[PDB]
Design a protein around this ligand. Structure first.
Ligand SMILES: Nc1ncnc2[nH]cnc12
Ligand SMILES: Nc1ncnc2[nH]cnc12
Ligand code: NA
Ligand code: NA
Lengths: 228, 230
């Protein structure tokens, strides 16, 4: 793993990464910018995808196919489900697409034919992240992260996702990014810090907490790069 | 490179079976957990695949066709639910696409809007005009209009009504807008063709089961007529 992608969805999710690097090259490609740097020995490729499943799919694919990365670390913010609250940070054990619905043909919610409802992340990277978290005296939650192309802000939708998928966080890119990595046989790590709890207060809470959460994730991802 | 390279993309095996049947002979390339079929046809190198259903798989497959296989243009062939005046058996090429299931309205954005992008993404005007000319030459009825995409198989009047009211879409499906957006981002001419298998209401599952292969065959036949006249 000499080339690693660091991916967020929004500019606020990668600004702290670039700030830490200080100097980097900028490559224009696929109607986006990709930032390249030699960071204490590994080549980092950094970008924000733009929001949602399609843009994050594109950007992850380009990082792997065009830039040739060996692994991909996703860093960003999410809504908390169940016991996940503002102040917490979670790495996915697996991802699901909560908005996939082909139940008309007798598939479960979340299931695309020829694929699976849950797609695992890298066990090896996840276990390293857990070791590092304990070293740093920080609590790293782990669990299923759910993804859809909606910003979720209702108890009704939250309860559906929890009941159907047993998810611990909700966001708009993790499952798409993780599935691209799965299909291309690239180790993935999906890290989210909690900005809101995906209920009726979520938009205001996001406005209050998203930058804090973005910085929390970016800080940990760079600690992981320092040791990976 | 001497030959244009064109991608022919469907979502399901049935959507590309008729394409492969017309080639008879092709190379099979395993990549990105899928199969890509490569053949020369009418002096053009065709790269043919089915993506698997939905926005993520179709985004991956289109990106791989462009980035890995180097295609110059992408023609999507498949089936869809008809909205408004569209009926089972009709064919429709998209003028533009929308993602009907995108919802960031919590922050004041319109339905379908991703920040930094646009609600409606155009397809290639040049390819669409060529298709309309060919349909006229062949005395075929080809509709055009906005096609809406989401990661749900739609089978309710309530959802149809929302999509029509919000987006003025004429068809609904699970890959067109994702494929078209990838093409837009990579500056690749796109053509999105759908034939109608159902009308996206409570009868849609049964109608799809009866008519999906018929519709797939119409779209594949027309896409190859288009390729014949490049
Ligand atoms: N409630 C929410 N829904 C979707 N994506 C999010 N990202 C942060 N909070 C979110
Ligand atoms: N009703 C429908 N919804 C989504 N995709 C389709 N493809 C064919 N019919 C469809
Ligand atoms: Na540095
Ligand atoms: Na907690």
């Amino acid at each position: 793993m000499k080339k690693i992608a660091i991916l967020g969805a929004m500019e606020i999710e990668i600004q702290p990464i670039l700030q830490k690097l200080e100097k980097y090259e900028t490559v224009e490609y696929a109607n986006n910018k990709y930032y390249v740097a030699n960071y204490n020995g590994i080549e980092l490729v950094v970008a924000y995808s733009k929001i949602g499943k399609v843009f994050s799919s594109l950007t992850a694919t380009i990082m792997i196919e065009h830039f040739g990365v060996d692994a991909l670390l996703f860093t960003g913010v999410a809504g908390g489900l169940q016991d996940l609250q503002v102040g917490d940070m979670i790495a996915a054990t697996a991802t699901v697409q909560h908005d996939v619905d082909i139940t008309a043909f007798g598939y479960p919610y979340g299931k695309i034919p020829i694929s699976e409802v849950e797609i695992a992340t890298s066990a090896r990277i996840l276990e390293q992240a857990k070791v590092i978290a304990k070293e740093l005296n920080l609590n790293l939650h782990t669990g299923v992260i759910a993804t859809g192309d909606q910003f979720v802000h209702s108890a009704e939708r939250k309860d559906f996702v929890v009941k159907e998928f047993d998810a611990k966080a909700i966001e708009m890119e993790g499952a798409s990014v993780n599935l691209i990595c799965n299909e291309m046989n690239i180790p993935s790590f999906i890290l989210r810090s909690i900005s809101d709890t995906a209920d009726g207060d979520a938009p205001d809470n996001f406005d209050e907490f998203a930058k804090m959460a973005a910085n929390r994730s970016a800080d940990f991802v760079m600690k992981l790069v320092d040791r990976i």
